[PDB]
Structure 1
Amino acid sequence: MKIAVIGQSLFGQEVYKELKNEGHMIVGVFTIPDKDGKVDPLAIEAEKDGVPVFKFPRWRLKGKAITEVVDQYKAVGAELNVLPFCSQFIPMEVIDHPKHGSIIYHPSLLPRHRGASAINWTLIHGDKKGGFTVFWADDGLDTGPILLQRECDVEPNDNVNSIYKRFLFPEGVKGMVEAVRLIATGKAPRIKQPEEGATYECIQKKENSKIDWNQPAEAIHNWIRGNDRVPGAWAEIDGKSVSFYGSTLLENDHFSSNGQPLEIPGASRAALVTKNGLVLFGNDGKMLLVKNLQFEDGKMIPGSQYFK
């Protein structure tokens, strides 16, 4: 079928590549403007293939869809829109335009974790299961009926990067390909999302990934890993912003360790720089270990090397 890919990122690129190799006609790719050194990987691949690339800075202005862009979009004659990791607001005129409307990839088990940082919140909340959903776009935020859903276990030390690389990315690509296949056959369902379990969480940016120390170690561990690697959970140490990566929870056994105390404003008690990383305490006095630290515009530095 004739498909428009509206989105970005390496995930967008891979979905594009796989649909193209399944014989679908990609009639256009609609991604974000250059950054400006960087052209989005989705645009790079499409341009090599001679597929039209569009980089609209926005699709609407002062609440109304921009006509010059909506016209450009419609001209390509898509039968289905596929939205891999779309960062832009797409007018419902566009969403609803194609024969089959639009499907969206969302990296959570909808209706849980609606919103753009769903992977982060899966981990921040300490969910034991995660996964992704492919759903039909409607006018709400991540509210449309489910086409298919796929689950995975969340590992106790998963961070955003590990669960994404292991499952959400590679299985997500397959899921989008399978979804389009089911649409091509008229077999794709529209399962109304249940009300029970619906949640929304805010978008994670540096500003709001600051560590709240007045929680148990397990919650701090979940917070760090749920923001690792981006945007990177952080705290002020010695007057500067320090980000934390590579968290694990710790147990007990004495003797081995000799760490050097490190004061962290707000921490329930001082941290310990040890040979294996930075030991942090929760408000329950329990411990977690952070392997890597980062200073503003950060070259990764092992926690063990904070003082040296």
Structure 2
Amino acid sequence: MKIAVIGQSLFGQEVYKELKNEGHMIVGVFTIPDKDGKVDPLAIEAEKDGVPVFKFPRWRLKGKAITEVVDQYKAVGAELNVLPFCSQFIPMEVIDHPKHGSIIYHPSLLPRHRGASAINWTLIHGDKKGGFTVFWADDGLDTGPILLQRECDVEPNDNVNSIYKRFLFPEGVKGMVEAVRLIATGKAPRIKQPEEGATYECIQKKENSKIDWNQPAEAIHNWIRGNDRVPGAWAEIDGKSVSFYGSTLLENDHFSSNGQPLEIPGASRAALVTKNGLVLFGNDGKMLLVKNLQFEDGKMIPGSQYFK
């Protein structure tokens, strides 16, 4: 069938490629502008294939849909919109335009974790199960009826990147293809999302990913891994903002106290720079180990080398 892809990133690129190779006519690709030496991966791939590529900075202005962008969208005549990681607000005029409406990939077990940082909050809350949902867009925020869903186990030391790469990305592409297949054969369902279990969490930016040290080590570990790599959990250390990556909870080594004491403002207790990384303490006195640190200038550095 005729499909418009509205999204961005590698995931968008992969969904576009698999849908095209399934035999679907991609009539248009709607993604983000270059910024600015960098073209979005979905834009690159579609352009290679001679598919119309649109780079709208925005779809609406002062709450109202922008007519130019809506008409340009409608010109390609999609019978279905597919939205893999759309970071822009898409007007319901576009959403409802095609024959089959629009479907959206969302990396949580809806109705849990509605909102654009679902993966982060899956880990921040320490969920044991995670996964993705493909759902039909309605006017709400990730509230639309479910087409399909897929589950995976969350690992104790999963960060955003690892759960994404192990399951959410590759199984997500497969799930998007299967969903379009179900729509094409005419048997895709619409399961109204249940009320119970529904949550929303805020979008994770640098501005709101600052570490609260007054928590158990397990909560701090979850916060750090739940923002690793993006946007990066951070705290102040000796004057400057430092991001923490590659966390794991520890057991019983004592501690080995062979490490070098590192004062961290607000921390329950001074940290330890050890040969294996930065040992941090929660308010329960329990430890986590951070592998890497990054400073204001994106300079990444192993935790073990803070002083060295």
TM-score range for the pair, normalised by the shorter chain length = over 0.9
**1:20-72 Cα shifts (integer Å, max 9, x gaps):** 00000000000011111111110000000000000111111112111111000
Q: Structure 1 vs Structure 2: percent identity of aligned residues?
A: 100
- Alpha-carbon distance, 1:262 to partner: 0.3
> CA–CA distance in 2 between the matches of 1:261 and 1:298?
24
> CA–CA distance in 1 between the matches of 2:213 and 2:253?
24
> CA–CA distance in 2 between the matches of 1:117 and 1:60?
22
**1:217-263 Cα shifts (integer Å, max 9, x gaps):** 00000000000011110110000011100000011135844010000
> CA–CA distance in 2 between the matches of 1:243 and 1:116?
21
> CA–CA distance in 2 between the matches of 1:255 and 1:130?
33
**1:65-99 Cα shifts (integer Å, max 9, x gaps):** 11111000001000000000101110100000000
> CA–CA distance in 1 between the matches of 2:117 and 2:306?
30
> CA–CA distance in 1 between the matches of 2:15 and 2:254?
51
> CA–CA distance in 1 between the matches of 2:46 and 2:80?
17
Q: Give TM-score scaled by structure 2 length.
A: 0.99
> CA–CA distance in 1 between the matches of 2:116 and 2:142?
9
**1:142-187 Cα shifts (integer Å, max 9, x gaps):** 0000000000000000000000000000000000000000000111
Greater CA drift, 279-288 or 248-257: 248-257
RMSD: 0.8
**1:88-111 Cα shifts (integer Å, max 9, x gaps):** 110100000000000000000000
Q: Give TM-score scaled by structure 1 length.
A: 0.99
> CA–CA distance in 2 between the matches of 1:59 and 1:271?
47
- Say whether the 8 Å CA contact 2:114–2:198 is kept in structure 1: yes
> CA–CA distance in 2 between the matches of 1:83 and 1:119?
17
- Say whether the 8 Å CA contact 2:257–2:272 is kept in structure 1: no
Distance 1:237 1:80, change over 3 A: same
- Corresponding position: 1:304 with 2:304: yes
**1:165-214 Cα shifts (integer Å, max 9, x gaps):** 00000000000000000000111000000000000000000111100000
> CA–CA distance in 2 between the matches of 1:297 and 1:73?
40
DSSP-derived class of the 1:105 partner = strand
> CA–CA distance in 2 between the matches of 1:257 and 1:285?
14
- Alpha-carbon distance, 1:297 to partner: 2.2
> CA–CA distance in 2 between the matches of 1:167 and 1:255?
35
- Residue 75 of structure 2 aligns with which residue? 75
**1:106-130 Cα shifts (integer Å, max 9, x gaps):** 0000000000000000000000000
- Corresponding position: 1:100 with 2:100: yes
DSSP-derived class of the 1:12 partner = helix
- Residue 216 of structure 1 aligns with which residue? 216
- Residue 273 of structure 2 aligns with which residue? 273
> CA–CA distance in 1 between the matches of 2:149 and 2:254?
47
Greater CA drift, 246-255 or 60-69: 246-255
